[PDB]
Coordinates of C-alpha atoms and ligand atoms in Angstrom, one line a residue:
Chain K
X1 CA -26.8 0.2 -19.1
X2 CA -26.1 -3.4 -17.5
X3 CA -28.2 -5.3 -15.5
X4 CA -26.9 -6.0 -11.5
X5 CA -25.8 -9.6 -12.9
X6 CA -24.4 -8.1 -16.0
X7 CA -22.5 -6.3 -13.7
X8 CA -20.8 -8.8 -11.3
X9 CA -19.2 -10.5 -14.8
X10 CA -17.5 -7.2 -15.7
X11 CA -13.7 -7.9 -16.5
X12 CA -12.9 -5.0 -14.0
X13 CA -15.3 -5.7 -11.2
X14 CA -14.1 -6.5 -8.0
X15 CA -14.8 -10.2 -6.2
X16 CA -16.6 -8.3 -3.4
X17 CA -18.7 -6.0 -5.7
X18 CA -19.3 -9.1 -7.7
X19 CA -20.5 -11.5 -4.9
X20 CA -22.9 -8.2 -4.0
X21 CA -23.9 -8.0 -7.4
X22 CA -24.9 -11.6 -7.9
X23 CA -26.8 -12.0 -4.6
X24 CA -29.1 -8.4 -5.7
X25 CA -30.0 -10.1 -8.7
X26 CA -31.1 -13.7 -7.4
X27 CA -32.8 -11.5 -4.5
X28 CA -34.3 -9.2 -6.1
X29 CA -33.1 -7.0 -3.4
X30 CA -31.0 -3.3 -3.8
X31 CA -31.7 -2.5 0.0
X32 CA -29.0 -2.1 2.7
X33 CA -30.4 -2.2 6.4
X34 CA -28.9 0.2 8.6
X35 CA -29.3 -1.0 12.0
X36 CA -28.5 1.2 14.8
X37 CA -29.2 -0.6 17.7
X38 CA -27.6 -0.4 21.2
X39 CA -27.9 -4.7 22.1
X40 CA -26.1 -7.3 20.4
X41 CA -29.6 -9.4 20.7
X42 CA -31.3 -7.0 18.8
X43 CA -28.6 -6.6 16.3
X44 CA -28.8 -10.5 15.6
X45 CA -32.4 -10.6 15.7
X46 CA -32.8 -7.6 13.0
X47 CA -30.3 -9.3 10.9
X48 CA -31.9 -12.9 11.1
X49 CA -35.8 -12.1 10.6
X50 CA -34.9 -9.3 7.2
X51 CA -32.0 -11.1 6.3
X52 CA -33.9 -12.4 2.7
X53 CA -35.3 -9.0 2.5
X54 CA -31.8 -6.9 2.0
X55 CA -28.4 -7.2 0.5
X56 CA -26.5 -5.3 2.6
X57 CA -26.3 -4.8 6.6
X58 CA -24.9 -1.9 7.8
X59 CA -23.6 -2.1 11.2
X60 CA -22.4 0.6 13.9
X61 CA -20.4 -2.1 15.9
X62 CA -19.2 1.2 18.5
X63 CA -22.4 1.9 19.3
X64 CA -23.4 -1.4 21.1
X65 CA -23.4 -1.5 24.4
X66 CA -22.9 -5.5 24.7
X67 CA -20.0 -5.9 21.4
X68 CA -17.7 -8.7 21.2
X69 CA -15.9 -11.0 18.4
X70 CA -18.7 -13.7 19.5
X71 CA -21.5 -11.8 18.1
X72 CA -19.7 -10.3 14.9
X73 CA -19.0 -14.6 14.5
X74 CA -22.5 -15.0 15.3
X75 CA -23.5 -12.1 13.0
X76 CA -21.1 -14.1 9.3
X77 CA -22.9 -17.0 10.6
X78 CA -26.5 -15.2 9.4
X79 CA -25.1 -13.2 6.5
X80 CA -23.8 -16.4 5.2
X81 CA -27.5 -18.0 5.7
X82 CA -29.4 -15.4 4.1
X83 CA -26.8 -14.0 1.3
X84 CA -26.2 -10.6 2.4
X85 CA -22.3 -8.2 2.8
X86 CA -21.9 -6.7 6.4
X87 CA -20.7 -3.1 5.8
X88 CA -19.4 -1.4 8.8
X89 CA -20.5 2.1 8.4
X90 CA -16.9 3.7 10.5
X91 CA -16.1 6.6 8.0
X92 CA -12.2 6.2 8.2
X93 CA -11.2 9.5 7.7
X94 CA -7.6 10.4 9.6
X95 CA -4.1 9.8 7.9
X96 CA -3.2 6.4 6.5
X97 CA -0.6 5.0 9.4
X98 CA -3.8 6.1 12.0
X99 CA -6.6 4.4 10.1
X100 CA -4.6 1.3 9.2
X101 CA -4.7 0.2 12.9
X102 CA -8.1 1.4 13.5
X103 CA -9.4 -1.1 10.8
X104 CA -7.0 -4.3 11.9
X105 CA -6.4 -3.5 15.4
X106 CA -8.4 -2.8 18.7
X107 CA -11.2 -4.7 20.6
X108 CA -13.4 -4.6 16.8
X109 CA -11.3 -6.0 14.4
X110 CA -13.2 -4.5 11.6
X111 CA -11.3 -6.1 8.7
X112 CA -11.7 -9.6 10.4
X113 CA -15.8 -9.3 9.8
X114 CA -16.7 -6.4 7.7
X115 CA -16.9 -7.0 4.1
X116 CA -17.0 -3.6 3.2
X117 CA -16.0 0.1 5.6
X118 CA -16.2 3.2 4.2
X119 CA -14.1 6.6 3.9
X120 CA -14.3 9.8 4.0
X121 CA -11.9 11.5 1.2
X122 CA -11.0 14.5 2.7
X123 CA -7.1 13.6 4.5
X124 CA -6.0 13.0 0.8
X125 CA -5.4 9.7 -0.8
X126 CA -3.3 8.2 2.2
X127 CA -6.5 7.1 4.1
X128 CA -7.4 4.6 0.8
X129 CA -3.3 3.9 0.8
X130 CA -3.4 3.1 4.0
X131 CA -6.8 1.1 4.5
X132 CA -5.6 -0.6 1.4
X133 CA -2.7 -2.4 3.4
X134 CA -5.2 -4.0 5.5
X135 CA -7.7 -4.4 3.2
X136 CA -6.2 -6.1 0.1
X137 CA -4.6 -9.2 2.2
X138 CA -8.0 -9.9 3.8
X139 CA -10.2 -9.6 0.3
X140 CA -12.1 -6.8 1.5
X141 CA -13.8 -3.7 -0.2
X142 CA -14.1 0.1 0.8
X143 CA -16.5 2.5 0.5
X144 CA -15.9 6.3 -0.7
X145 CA -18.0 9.1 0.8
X146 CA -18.7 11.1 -2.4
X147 CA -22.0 12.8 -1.2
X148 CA -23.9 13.2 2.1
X149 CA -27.8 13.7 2.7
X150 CA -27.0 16.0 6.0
X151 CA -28.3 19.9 5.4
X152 CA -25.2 22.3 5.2
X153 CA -23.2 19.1 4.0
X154 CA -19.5 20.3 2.3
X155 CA -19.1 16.7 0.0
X156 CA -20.1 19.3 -3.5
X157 CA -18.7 20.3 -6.3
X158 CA -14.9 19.7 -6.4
X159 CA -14.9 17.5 -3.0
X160 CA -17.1 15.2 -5.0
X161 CA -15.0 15.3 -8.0
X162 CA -11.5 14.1 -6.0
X163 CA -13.8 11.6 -4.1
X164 CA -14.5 10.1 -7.6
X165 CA -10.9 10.2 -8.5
X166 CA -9.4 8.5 -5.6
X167 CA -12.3 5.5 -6.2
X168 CA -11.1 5.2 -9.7
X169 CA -7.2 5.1 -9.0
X170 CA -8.1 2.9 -6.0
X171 CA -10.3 0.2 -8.2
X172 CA -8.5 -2.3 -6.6
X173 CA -9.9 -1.7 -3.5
X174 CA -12.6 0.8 -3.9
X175 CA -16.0 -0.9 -5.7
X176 CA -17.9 2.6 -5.2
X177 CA -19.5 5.3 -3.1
X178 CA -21.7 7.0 -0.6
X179 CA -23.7 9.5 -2.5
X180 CA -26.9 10.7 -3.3
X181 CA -27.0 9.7 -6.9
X182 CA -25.0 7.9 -9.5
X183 CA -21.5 10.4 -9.8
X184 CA -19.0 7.8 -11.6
X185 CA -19.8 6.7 -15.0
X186 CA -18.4 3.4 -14.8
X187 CA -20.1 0.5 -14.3
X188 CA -17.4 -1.7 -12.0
X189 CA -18.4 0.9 -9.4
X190 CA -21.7 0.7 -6.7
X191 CA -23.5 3.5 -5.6
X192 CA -25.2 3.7 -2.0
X193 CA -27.3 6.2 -1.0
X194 CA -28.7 6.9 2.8
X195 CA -31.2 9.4 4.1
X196 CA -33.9 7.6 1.9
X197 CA -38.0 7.4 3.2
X198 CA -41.0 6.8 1.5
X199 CA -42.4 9.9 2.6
X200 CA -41.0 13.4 2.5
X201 CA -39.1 14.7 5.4
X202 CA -35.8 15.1 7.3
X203 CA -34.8 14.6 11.3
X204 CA -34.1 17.3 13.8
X205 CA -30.6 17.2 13.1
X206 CA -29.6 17.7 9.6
X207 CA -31.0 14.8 8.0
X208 CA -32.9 14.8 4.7
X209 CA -34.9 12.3 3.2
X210 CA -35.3 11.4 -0.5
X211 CA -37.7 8.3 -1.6
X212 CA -36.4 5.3 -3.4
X213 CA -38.0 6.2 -6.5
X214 CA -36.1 9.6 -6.7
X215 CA -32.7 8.3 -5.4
X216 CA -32.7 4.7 -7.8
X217 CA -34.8 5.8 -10.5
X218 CA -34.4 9.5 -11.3
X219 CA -30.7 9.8 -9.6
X220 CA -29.3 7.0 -10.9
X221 CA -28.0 5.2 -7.8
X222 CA -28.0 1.4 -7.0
X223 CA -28.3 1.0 -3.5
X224 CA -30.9 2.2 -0.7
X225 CA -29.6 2.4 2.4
X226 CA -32.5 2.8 5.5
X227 CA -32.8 2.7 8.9
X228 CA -35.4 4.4 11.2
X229 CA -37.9 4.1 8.0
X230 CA -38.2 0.6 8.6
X231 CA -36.8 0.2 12.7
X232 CA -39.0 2.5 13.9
X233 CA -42.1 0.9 11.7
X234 CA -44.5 -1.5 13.9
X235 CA -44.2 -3.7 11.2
X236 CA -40.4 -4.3 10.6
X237 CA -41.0 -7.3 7.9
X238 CA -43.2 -5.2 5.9
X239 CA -41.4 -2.0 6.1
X240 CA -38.6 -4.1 4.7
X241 CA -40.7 -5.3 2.2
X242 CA -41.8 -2.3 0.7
X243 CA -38.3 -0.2 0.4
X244 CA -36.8 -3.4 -1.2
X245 CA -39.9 -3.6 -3.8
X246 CA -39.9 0.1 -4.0
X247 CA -36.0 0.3 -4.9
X248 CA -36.4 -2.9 -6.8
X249 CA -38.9 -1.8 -9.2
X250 CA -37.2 1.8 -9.8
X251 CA -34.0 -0.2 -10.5
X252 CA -36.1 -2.4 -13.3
X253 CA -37.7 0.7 -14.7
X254 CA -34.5 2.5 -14.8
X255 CA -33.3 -0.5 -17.4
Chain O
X1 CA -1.2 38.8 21.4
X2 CA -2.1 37.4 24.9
X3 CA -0.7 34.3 27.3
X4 CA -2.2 31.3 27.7
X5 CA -2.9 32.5 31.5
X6 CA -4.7 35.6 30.2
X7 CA -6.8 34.0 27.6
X8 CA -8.1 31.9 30.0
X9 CA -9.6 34.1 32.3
X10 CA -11.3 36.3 28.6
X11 CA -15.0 37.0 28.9
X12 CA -16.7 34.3 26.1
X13 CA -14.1 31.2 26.9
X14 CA -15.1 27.8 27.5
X15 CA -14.5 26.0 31.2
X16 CA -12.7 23.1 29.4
X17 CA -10.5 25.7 27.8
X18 CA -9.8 27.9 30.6
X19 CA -9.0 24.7 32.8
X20 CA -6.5 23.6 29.8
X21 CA -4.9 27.0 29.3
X22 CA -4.3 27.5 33.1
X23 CA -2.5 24.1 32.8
X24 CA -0.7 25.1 30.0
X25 CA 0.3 28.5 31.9
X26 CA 1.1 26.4 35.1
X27 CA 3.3 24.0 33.9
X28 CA 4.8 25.7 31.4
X29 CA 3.8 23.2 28.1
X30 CA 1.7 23.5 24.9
X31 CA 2.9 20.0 24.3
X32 CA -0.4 17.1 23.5
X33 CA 0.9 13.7 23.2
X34 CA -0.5 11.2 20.5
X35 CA -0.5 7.9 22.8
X36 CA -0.8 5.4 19.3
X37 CA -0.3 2.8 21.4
X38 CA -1.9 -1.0 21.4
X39 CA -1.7 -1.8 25.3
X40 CA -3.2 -0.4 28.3
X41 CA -0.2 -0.3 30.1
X42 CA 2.1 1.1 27.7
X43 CA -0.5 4.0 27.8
X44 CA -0.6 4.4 31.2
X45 CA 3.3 4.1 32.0
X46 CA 3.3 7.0 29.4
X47 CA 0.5 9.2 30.8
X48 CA 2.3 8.3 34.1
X49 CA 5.6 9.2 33.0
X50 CA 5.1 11.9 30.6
X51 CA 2.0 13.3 32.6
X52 CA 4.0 16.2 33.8
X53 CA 5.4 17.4 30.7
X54 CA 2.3 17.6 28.9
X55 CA -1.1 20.0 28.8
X56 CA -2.8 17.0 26.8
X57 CA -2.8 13.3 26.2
X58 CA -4.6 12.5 23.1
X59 CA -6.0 9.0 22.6
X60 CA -7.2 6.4 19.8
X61 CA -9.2 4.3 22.3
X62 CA -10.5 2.4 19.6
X63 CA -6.8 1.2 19.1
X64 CA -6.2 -0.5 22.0
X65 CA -6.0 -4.3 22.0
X66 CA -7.2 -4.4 25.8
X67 CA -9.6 -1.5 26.5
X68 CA -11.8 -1.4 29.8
X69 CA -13.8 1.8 31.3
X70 CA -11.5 0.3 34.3
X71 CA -8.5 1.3 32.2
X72 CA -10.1 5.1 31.6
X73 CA -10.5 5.5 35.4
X74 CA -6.8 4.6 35.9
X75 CA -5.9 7.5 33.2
X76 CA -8.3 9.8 34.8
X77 CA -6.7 9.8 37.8
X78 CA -3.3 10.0 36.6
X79 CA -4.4 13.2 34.1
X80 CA -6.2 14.4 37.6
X81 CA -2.5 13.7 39.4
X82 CA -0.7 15.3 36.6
X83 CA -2.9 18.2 35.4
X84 CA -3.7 17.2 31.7
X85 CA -6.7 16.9 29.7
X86 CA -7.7 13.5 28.1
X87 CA -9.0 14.2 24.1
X88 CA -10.1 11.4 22.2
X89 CA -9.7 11.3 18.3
X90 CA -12.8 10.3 17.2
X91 CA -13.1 12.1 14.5
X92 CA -17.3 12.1 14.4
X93 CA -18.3 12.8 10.7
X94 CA -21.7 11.4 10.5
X95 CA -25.4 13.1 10.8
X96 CA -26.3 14.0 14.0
X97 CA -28.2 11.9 15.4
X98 CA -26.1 9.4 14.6
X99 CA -23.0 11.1 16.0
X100 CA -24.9 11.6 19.4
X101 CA -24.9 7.9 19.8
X102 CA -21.5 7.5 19.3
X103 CA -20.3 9.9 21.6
X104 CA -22.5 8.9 24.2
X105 CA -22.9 5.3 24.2
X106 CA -21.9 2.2 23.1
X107 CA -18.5 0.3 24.7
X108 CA -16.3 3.2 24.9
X109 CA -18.6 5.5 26.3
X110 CA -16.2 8.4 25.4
X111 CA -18.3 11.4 26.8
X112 CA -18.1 10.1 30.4
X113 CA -13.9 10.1 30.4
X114 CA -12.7 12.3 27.9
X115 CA -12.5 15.8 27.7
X116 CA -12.0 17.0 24.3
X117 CA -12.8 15.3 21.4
X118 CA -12.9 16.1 17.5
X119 CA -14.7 16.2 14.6
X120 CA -15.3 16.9 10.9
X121 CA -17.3 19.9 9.6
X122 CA -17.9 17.5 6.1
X123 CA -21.5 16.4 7.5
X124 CA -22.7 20.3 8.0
X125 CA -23.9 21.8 11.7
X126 CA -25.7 19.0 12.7
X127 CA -22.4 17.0 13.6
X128 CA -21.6 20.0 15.6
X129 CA -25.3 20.0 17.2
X130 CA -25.8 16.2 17.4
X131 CA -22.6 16.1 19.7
X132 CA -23.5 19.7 21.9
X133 CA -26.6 17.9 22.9
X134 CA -24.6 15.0 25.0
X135 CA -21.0 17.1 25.6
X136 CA -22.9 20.2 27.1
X137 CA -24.6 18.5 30.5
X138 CA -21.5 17.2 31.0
X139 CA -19.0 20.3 30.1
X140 CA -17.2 19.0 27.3
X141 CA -15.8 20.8 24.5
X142 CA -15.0 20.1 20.5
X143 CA -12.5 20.8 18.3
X144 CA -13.6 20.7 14.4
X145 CA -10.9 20.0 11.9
X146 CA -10.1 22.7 9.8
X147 CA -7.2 21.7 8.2
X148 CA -5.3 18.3 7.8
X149 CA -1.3 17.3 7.5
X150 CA -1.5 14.8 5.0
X151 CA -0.9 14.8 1.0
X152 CA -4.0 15.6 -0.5
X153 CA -6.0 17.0 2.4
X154 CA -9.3 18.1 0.9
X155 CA -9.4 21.0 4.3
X156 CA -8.8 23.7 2.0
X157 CA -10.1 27.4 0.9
X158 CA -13.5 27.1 1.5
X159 CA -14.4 24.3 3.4
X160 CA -11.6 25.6 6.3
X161 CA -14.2 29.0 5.8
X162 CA -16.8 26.6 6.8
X163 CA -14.9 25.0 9.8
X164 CA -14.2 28.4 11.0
X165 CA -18.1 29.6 10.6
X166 CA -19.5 26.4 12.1
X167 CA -17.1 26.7 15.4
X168 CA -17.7 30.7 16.0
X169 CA -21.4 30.1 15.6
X170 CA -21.4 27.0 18.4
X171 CA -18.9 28.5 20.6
X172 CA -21.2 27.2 23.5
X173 CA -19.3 23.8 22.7
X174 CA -16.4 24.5 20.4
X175 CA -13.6 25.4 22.0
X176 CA -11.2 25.5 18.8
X177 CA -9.6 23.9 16.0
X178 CA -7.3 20.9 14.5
X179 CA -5.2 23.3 12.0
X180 CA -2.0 23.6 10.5
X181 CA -2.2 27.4 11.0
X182 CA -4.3 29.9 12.9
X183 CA -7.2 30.0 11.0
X184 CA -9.4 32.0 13.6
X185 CA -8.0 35.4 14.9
X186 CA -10.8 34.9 18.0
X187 CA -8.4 34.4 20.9
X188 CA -11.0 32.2 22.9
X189 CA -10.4 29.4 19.7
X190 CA -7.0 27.1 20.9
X191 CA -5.6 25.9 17.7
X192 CA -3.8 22.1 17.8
X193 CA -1.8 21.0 15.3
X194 CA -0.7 17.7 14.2
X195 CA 2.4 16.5 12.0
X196 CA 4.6 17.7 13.5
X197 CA 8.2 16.4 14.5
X198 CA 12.3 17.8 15.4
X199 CA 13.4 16.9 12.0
X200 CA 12.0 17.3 8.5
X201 CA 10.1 14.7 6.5
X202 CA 6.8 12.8 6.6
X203 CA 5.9 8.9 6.5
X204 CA 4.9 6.8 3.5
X205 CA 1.1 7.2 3.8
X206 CA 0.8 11.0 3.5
X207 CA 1.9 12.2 6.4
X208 CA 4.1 15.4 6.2
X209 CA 6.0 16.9 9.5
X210 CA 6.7 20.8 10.0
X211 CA 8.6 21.8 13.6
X212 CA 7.1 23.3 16.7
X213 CA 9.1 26.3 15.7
X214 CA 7.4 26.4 12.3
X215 CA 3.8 25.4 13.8
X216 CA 4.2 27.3 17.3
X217 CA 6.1 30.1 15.7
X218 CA 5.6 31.4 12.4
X219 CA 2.2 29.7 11.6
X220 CA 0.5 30.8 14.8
X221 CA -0.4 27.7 16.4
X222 CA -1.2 27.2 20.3
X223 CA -0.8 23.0 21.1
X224 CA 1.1 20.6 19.0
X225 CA -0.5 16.8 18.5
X226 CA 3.0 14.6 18.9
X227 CA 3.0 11.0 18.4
X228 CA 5.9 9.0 16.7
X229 CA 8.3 11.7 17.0
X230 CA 8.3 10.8 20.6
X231 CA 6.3 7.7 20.9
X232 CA 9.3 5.6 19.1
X233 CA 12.0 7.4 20.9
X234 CA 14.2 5.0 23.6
X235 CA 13.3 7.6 26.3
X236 CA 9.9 9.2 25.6
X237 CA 10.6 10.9 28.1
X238 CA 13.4 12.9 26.9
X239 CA 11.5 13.5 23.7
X240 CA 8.5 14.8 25.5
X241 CA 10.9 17.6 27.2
X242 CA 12.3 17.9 23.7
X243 CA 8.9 19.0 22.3
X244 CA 8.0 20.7 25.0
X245 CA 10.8 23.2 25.5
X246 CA 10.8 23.5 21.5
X247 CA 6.7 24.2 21.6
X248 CA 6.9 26.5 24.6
X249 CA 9.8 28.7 23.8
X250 CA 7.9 28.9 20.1
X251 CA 5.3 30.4 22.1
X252 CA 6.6 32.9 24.4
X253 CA 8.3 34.5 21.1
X254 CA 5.1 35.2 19.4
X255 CA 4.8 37.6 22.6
Ligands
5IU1 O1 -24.1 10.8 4.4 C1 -24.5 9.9 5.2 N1 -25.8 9.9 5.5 C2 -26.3 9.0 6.4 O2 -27.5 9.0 6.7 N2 -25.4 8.0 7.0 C3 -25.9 7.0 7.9 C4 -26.3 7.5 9.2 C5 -27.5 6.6 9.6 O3 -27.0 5.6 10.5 C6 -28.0 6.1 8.3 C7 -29.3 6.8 7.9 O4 -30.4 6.0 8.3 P1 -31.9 6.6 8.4 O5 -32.6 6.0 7.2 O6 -32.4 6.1 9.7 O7 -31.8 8.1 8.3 O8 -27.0 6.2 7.4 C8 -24.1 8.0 6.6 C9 -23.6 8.9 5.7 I1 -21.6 8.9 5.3
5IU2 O1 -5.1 16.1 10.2 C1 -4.7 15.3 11.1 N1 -3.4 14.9 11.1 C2 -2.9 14.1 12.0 O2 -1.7 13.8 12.0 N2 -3.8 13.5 13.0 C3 -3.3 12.6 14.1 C4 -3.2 11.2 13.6 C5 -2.1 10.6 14.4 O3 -2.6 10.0 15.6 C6 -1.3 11.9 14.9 C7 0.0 12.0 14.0 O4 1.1 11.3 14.7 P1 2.6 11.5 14.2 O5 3.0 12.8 14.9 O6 3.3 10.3 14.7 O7 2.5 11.6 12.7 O8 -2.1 13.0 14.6 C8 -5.1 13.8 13.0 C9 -5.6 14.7 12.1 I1 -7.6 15.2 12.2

């Protein structure tokens, strides 16, 4: 087992994985911000004040009210300042001719600004193929969703074991998953894992939460991904604070 | 086996379907048209033009280059005028309460213009109940994908078990399926089906083509998706009728 900056120097890491890897390590951050917000403001402001705090952003750029190019510039501008990737959380998941355009094309322009997307496995290997074509040109990494956290969720067993599969004849493009714990064994590849809290619980709609501890330390992933655990806090700063020095600390303990 | 005009006037059916199916039944097409188009007006001279022909005009709003809620009023009166259904492909496949906020708000606003639109059953239920909570005020409906085209499509066995579960226990907001088969012998389901074109083949990202005949015909289908097969035709309009004529005589010999 490597450490994060062990990692990034791996002859078979990726340059997007790599730059992800270094800036965890200098941070001391494995915490990705998921910040679902409806104004562009608050988007920038979120980003800005916990920007040392996290190495990852994850954005929902189609649920803004107020989007434009101008505030995805706006938005580089910050992750360049305060080292951290902008991953657009749009779970490609149609044939690869459809998803190519959806990831160039349009009013978002995804590829132009988001450092990593992700993808959902189940059209087959075409939706990788075809984000590829897009993705390669513009230096850019992609996400695939191996696992979810939702109750009733159908990513098990088998669908987990092609998701793996596609990431590993993909490594060109894919640097790792979505999941709720470590499923590759190879080291090249990240893991990210959503519906994490500090305190036991779910939502009203499907979502279950597991604690960083659990999800870094005892299921092997790398990555904490969080959002109304630390939006919905009084205390946004310190909420950030403590998942970063939670996940932190598992990840040291787990080495 | 039952017409499209009798089905919609059965007991437990859906006002969005009913309204389609009497369309259908009308104006003699099961034909929805895939508008993959970049431009505003390229998508409206084709609503405009092809209107008539079809029961269903499917869109990638996230696609277009010059999208404006002014743009979706213009297409809602022309599928007003014309007498088809607007569906957007959005393919939700996040938690719920994430999905809610993608259909509802943000730029495209898709649950104040469209009709129909789609999601996958990979998340569990709470896709299914995140999006009922927005579509139902406003009468909308919900195809889950069952099934997919493409090479490798992990909607298989199983997990096309669980699509079929997950609709016939939210029937309230699912009004059928994207298939490649019937895959529910419920006659208040409509079943759509993608990849499909005249002549045999596929593209070079995974999509593979069967004929209306085939789809309509012998695999039990109601609605074929069509996109490039008449999309990059000289006269679309031709190829609508083409696809039409071919997906409606389909039909009336399965009676
Ligand atoms: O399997 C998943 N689970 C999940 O929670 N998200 C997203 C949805 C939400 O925006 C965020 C979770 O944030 P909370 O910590 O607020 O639940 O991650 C995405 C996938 I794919
Ligand atoms: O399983 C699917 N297969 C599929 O082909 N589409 C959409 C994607 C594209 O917009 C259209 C296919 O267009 P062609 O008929 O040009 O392949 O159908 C969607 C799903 I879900």
């Amino acid at each position: 087992e490597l450490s994060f900056g062990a990692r990034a120097e791996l002859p078979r890491i990726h340059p997007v994985a790599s730059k992800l890897l270094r800036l965890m390590q200098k941070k001391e951050t494995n915490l990705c911000l998921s910040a679902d917000v409806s104004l562009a403001r608050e988007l920038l402001q979120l980003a800005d004040a916990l920007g040392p705090s996290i190495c990852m952003l994850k954005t929902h750029v189609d649920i803004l009210n107020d989007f434009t190019l101008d505030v995805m510039k706006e938005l580089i501008t910050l992750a360049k300042c305060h080292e951290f990737l902008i991953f657009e959380d749009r779970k490609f998941a149609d044939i690869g001719n459809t998803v190519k355009k959806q990831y160039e094309g349009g009013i978002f322009k995804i590829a132009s600004w988001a450092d990593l997307v992700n993808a959902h496995v189940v059209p087959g290997s075409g939706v990788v193929k075809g984000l590829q074509e897009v993705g390669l040109p513009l230096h850019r990494g992609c996400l695939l969703i191996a696992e979810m956290s939702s109750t009733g969720s159908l990513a098990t067993g088998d669908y987990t074991r092609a998701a793996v599969r596609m990431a590993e004849e993909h490594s060109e493009f894919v640097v790792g998953f979505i999941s709720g714990s470590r499923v590759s064994m190879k080291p090249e590849f990240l893991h990210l894992t959503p519906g994490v809290q500090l305190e036991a619980g779910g939502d009203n709609l499907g979502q279950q939460y597991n604690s960083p501890q659990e999800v870094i330390g005892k299921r092997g992933s790398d990555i904490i991904i969080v959002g109304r655990g630390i939006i919905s806090a009084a205390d946004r700063l310190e909420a950030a604070e403590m998942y970063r020095k939670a996940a932190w600390e598992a990840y040291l303990s787990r080495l």
